[PDB]
A paper describes a structure:
The X-ray crystal structure of the N-terminal kinase domain of RSK2 (residues 44–367) complexed with AMP-PNP was refined to 1.8 Å resolution. The NTD RSK2 adopted an overall protein kinase two-lobal scaffold with the ATP-binding site in the cleft between the small N-terminal lobe and large α-helical C-terminal lobe. The T-activation loop (residues 220–230), part of the αC-helix (residues 111–119), and the N- and C-termini (residues 44–46 and 347–367, respectively) were not visible in the electron density map and were not included in the current model. The βB-sheet insert is comprised of three antiparallel β-strands: the β-1-strand (residues 48–52) at the N-terminal end; the novel βB-strand (residues 104–109); and the β9-strand of the activation segment (residues 215–217). In the NTD RSK2 structure, the αC-helix is pushed away from its regular position by the βB-sheet, and consequently, the conserved Glu118 residue (invisible in the structure) from the αC-helix cannot interact with Lys100. The lysine, located on the βB-sheet, interacts with the β-phosphate (distance 2.66 Å) and the conserved Asp211 (distance 2.86 Å) from the DFG-motif. Instead of the salt bridge, Lys100-Glu118, a new mode of connection appeared – Lys100-β-phosphate-Lys216. Surprisingly, the isolated NTD RSK2 displayed in vitro kinase activity toward the S6 peptide even without activation by PDK1. We present a kinase structure that would be classified as having an “inactive” conformation (the displaced αC-helix), but is actually an active phosphorylated kinase confirmed by complementary protein activity assay. Whereas in PKB this region is occupied by the C-terminal hydrophobic motif (HM), in the NTD RSK2, the N-terminal β0-strand (residues 55–57) is anchored to that groove by several hydrogen bonds with the β4-strand.
Author numbering: 47 to 110, 120 to 219, 231 to 346
Write the structure that this text describes.
Amino acid sequence: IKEIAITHHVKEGHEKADPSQFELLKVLGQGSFGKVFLVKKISGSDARQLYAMKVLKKATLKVRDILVEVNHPFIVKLHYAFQTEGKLYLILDFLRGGDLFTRLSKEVMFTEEDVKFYLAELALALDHLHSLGIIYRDLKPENILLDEEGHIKLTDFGLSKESITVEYMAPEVVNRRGHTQSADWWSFGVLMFEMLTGTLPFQGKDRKETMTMILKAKLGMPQFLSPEAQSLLRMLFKRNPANRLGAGPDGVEEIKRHSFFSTIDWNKLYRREIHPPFKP
Ligand SMILES: Nc1ncnc2c1ncn2[C@@H]1O[C@H](COP(=O)(O)OP(=O)(O)NP(=O)(O)O)[C@@H](O)[C@H]1O
């Protein structure tokens, strides 16, 4: 594993930035690694532009140019990174659509096909990262936002962060036995399960018990899902990572060709030709 320290970045077009070129407007949210702020760029070619800002102690990209390669239609863009006073500042797209789960909660009647749209965009994003040797690792609802047009935007791209949710973690991750991109497809299944049923597949009274459940508990198949949805769940919820959908020879194509996704034109999806089920 090649660990790439994140210390500096300037998007093409921009000029090198520093803390004095921004002003704080408000807090956008709070993550495990700290608050996320709304900031305004006060000077430079992009003066007056709004961005999100994270302030960490440090961040590294573990990989089994890169900060440009991770660019994708459904992944947040990093515009700047700089360090000042033992702190790392990350300046990112301001994602304006709020989180996906909140948008879904505002809808009484959403369908399997609605959820399928968001899962499909998420799958493209995940595979993109995998293609670069990156594993998302900590995929959870709070990382899945929407842009102003209602398309998926992940809030990170696999950074291992240090500041200044076991429910989504794969069995092989829980027991510290190993770790590959296959773990991301388990998390993917958990998100699918949760969006389609309104409940988590594994959750105990505390983290200790949740972990044991992930490793050994039975799981009932939701009976009011389509046969295709049930099949995808069965294929993602393999505790042996080598046998999990997406881990075979054809990789992500195993997922894209699955009957659940038969309605999706992946090329049109990538190009954002398909209208999202709901608008911000
Ligand atoms: N680019 C963004 N634009 C707007 N809001 C954001 C952005 N990134 C994060 N947020 C908000 O901040 C919350 C936390 O985001 P997250 O990326 O999880 O932060 P983090 O510090 O990396 N913590 P975590 O990822 O949980 O370890 C999200 O759920 C959003 O509500």
